[PDB]
Amino acid sequence: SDAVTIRTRKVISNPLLARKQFVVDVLHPNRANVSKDELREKLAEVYKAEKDAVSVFGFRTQFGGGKSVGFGLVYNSVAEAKKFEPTYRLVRYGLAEKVEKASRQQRKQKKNRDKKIFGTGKRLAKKVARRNAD
């Protein structure tokens, strides 16, 4: 917004992962809260790269508020950002979504059952149904 003096330091530009990673320093005295979307779009508008090219996390707020420090990385393009950013991070940002599945215990039990079952199981089910019928 106005006089937010949000800065980035220790910036390194690595074409290996094709990004620019740095520590973000946010000074918001007498300000209620800065959100993840606000911070990312502000870093985007000051780095003139792209709105979704920037990704910020961490955001440890110093004791008593007023100042916060985090990590921030800007990709050269949305394609590289999607390729390199973690799936959970993309889901948290909204750039991606992972389809809900069964819980760990349930899927492990499914794997136990179909590891006990040998073969496809269609023939076994047909034989069981035939035996039940007769």
Binding site: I12, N14, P15, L16, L17, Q21, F71, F84, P86
Partner: protein, 258 residues
């Protein structure tokens, strides 16, 4: 043991890797490779806590599988590839090569240099013998063997490997008055212009090595590695030149030129 060891924990890993005791309980174990387990630096930890290029194991492994880095002229997409002393790893992105050298205090220092030093490197001969079909050969510290060496090469010598061909461009022998590099013990990373040797027939030879400060010390023959003749080096010396200054002088020099 019932089998080989496949894990390594923090605080049980060699000191020169500089692993923090928190933020995990296991250490990156280097598998079979060109260097020892202790006297080597895995690529993952090298990328993680020496250059800060990447900050995640997942990102590091992705970097390795995307073929964006290579070792000694080879990609070597191993997530825990061990690269020890005198190892050259060039980076096509900006074309910067890192030599894994030993600092004065005894840790895996990294030296960033250009394409010529990327191409040419140094190696220490471990033994020279005759193979099958009457073929003589040598053994180096990194396993970079050259076939059919010149007959002057004996044990405890150093050679220059061009990393592209199989020919030894330069060879430097073992005698008095040569620039050396002690890799082992408490003097890890010291250059001291070897003076003389006590053989002690039966093994475990001792070498008298004296730094330019006239700081003379001794080391096992198994730890010294000649890196060039007096004066000019074969490879660029790291920062500090391997001096190991006295504690009071080093502390007040830090206080002055902090």
């Amino acid at each position: 043991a019932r089998g080989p060891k496949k894990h390594l924990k923090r605080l049980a890993a060699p000191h020169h890797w500089l692993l923090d005791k928190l933020s995990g309980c296991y250490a990156p174990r280097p598998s079979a490779g060109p260097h020892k387990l202790r006297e080597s630096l895995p690529l993952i930890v090298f990328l993680r806590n020496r250059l800060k290029y990447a900050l995640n194991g997942r990102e590091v492994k992705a970097i390795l599988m995307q073929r964006h880095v290579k070792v000694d002229g080879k990609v070597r997409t191993d997530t825990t590839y061990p690269a020890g002393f005198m190892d050259v790893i060039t980076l096509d992105a900006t074309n910067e090569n890192f030599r894994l050298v030993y600092d004065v205090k005894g840790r895996f220092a990294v030296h960033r240099i250009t394409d010529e030093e990327a191409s040419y490197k140094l190696g220490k001969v471990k033994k020279v013998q005759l193979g099958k079909k009457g073929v003589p050969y040598v053994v180096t510290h990194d396993g970079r063997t050259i076939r059919y060496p010149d007959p002057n090469i004996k044990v405890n010598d150093t050679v220059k490997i061009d990393l592209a061909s199989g020919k030894i461009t330069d060879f430097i022998k073992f005698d008095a008055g040569k620039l050396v590099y002690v890799t082992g013990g408490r003097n890890l990373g010291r250059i001291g212009t070897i003076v003389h040797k006590e053989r002690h027939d039966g093994g475990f030879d001792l070498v008298h090595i004296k730094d330019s400060l006239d700081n003379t010390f001794v080391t096992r023959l198994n730890n010294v590695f000649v890196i060039g003749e007096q004066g000019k080096p074969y490879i660029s010396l790291p920062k500090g030149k391997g001096i190991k200054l006295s504690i009071a002088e080093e502390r007040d020099r830090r206080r002055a030129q902090q």
